[PDB]
Every structure is written in structure tokens, then in C-alpha cells.
Amino acid sequence: MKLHELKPAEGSRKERNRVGRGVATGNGKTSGRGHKGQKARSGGGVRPGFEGGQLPLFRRLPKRGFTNIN
Amino acid sequence: MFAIIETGGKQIKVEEGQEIFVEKLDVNEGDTFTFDKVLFVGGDSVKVGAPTVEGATVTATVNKQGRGKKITVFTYKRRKNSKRKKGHRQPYTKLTIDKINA
Numbered sequence: 001m002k003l004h005e006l007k008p009a010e011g012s013r014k015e016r017n018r019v020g021r022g023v024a025t026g027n028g029k030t031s032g033r034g035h036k037g038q039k040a041r042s043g044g045g046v047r048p049g050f051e052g053g054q055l056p057l058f059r060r061l062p063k064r065g066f067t068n069i070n
Numbered sequence: 071m072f073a074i075i076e077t078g079g080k081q082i083k084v085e086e087g088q089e090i091f092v093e094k095l096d097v098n099e100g101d102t103f104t105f106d107k108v109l110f111v112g113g114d115s116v117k118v119g120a121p122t123v124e125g126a127t128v129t130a131t132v133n134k135q136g137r138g139k140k141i142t143v144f145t146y147k148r149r150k151n152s153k154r155k156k157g158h159r160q161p162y163t164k165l166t167i168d169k170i171n172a
């Protein structure tokens with residue numbers, strides 16, 4: 001390490017992807033096609049049209065809890 | 071008095087004192103090559119081989135071991151988004167003939 005011969009650790013650091021800069025790059029549509037690959041882009045957050053992130057519920061909580069030494 | 075020699079992937083017609091240009095020959099830049107595959111020899115007397123007129127070496131001297139003009143291989147599919155460019159320069163050998171069948 002001589003400041004004009006800096007060398008970053010092997011396998012750390014890798015150039016970021018730059019989409020939308022050309023075609024040979026492999027990214028000029030950028031990504032998607034035709035759909036909601038529009039800018040707003042909202043998928044919805046986690047959903048389809050039938051809500052299965054909900055079926056029924058079971059719950060309660062009071063004060064308690066210790067700390068384990070084996 | 072000329073002669074036809076197999077030598078590249080191809081055959082060649084050589085009269086001697088005649089610079090020739092064949093596929094990179096994998097020999098030195100001053101050494102004299104001797105072509106082994108001679109098909110036919112013309113002139114006043116004429117041997118016409120089966121494959122190979124038996125015996126009969128054409129001899130030449132190596133002059134350059136070179137690479138030809140670059141030619142860029144560019145290609146594209148219209149509309150459907152995809153070109154491809156590659157430069158190419160073929161290696162060769164320029165020899166010059168001396169004493170065919172001698």
C-alpha cells in the first residue's frame with residue numbers, strides 16, 4: 001500500500017449495473033415490456049385479486065420472560 | 071514449365087520466380103520450404119499424377135510471414151435489436167518459387 005498503488009481486496013467491489021445506456025449492454029427497454037414496467041410501477045405491495053395474506057387470527061400477550069443460562 | 075501443388079486448403083499453380091501467397095506455413099522467415107503435394111506439371115514434357123506426381127518437389131523460399139488487411143465483420147438483424155462487429159486479419163506466408171521439380 002503505497003497510495004499510488006492501492007489495491008482493493010480481491011472479490012470485494014464490482015461495478016454497478018447501468019441500465020438504459022445502449023443496447024449491446026443488454027439493457028435498453030431497460031427491463032420489462034409493455035406492461036406495468038411503467039415508472040409508477042406499483043405491483044401492489046404483495047397481492048393478486050384474492051387476498052391470501054389473510055385467513056383468520058389468533059392472539060394475546062401479557063408481561064413476562066426470563067434470560068437463559070444453560 | 072509450371073506445376074500445380076496442394077498447399078493451403080487449396081491448390082496452387084506455380085511457375086517459379088513467382089511470388090506466391092499461401093496459408094501461414096509454420097516455418098521460419100528465411101528458410102526454404104519444399105512443397106510435398108504436386109498434382110501435375112506442365113511445360114514441354116508433362117507429368118500428370120494420380121493424386122501426387124511421384125517424386126517432384128516444388129521449392130520456394132519464405133519471404134514474409136504476414137497478416138492481411140483488416141476486414142470488419144459487421145452484421146445485424148433489422149428491427150429485432152441486435153448487431154455484432156468483429157475485426158479480422160488473416161495470417162499468411164509469402165514465398166517465392168525456385169526450381170520446380172528440382
Ligand SMILES: [Mg+2]
Nearest residue numbers: 054055056057
Ligand atoms: Mg387477517
Ligand SMILES: [Mn+2]
Nearest residue numbers: 015016017018
Ligand atoms: Mn458490468
Ligand SMILES: [Mn+2]
Nearest residue numbers: 023025026027
Ligand atoms: Mn437482451
Ligand SMILES: [Mn+2]
Nearest residue numbers: 029033034035
Ligand atoms: Mn415501448
Ligand SMILES: [Mn+2]
Nearest residue numbers: 032033035036
Ligand atoms: Mn410485463
Ligand SMILES: [Mn+2]
Nearest residue numbers: 031037038039
Ligand atoms: Mn421500470
Ligand SMILES: [Mn+2]
Nearest residue numbers: 038039040041
Ligand atoms: Mn410518474
Ligand SMILES: [Mn+2]
Nearest residue numbers: 044045046047
Ligand atoms: Mn394493497
Ligand SMILES: [Mn+2]
Nearest residue numbers: 094095096097
Ligand atoms: Mn500451426
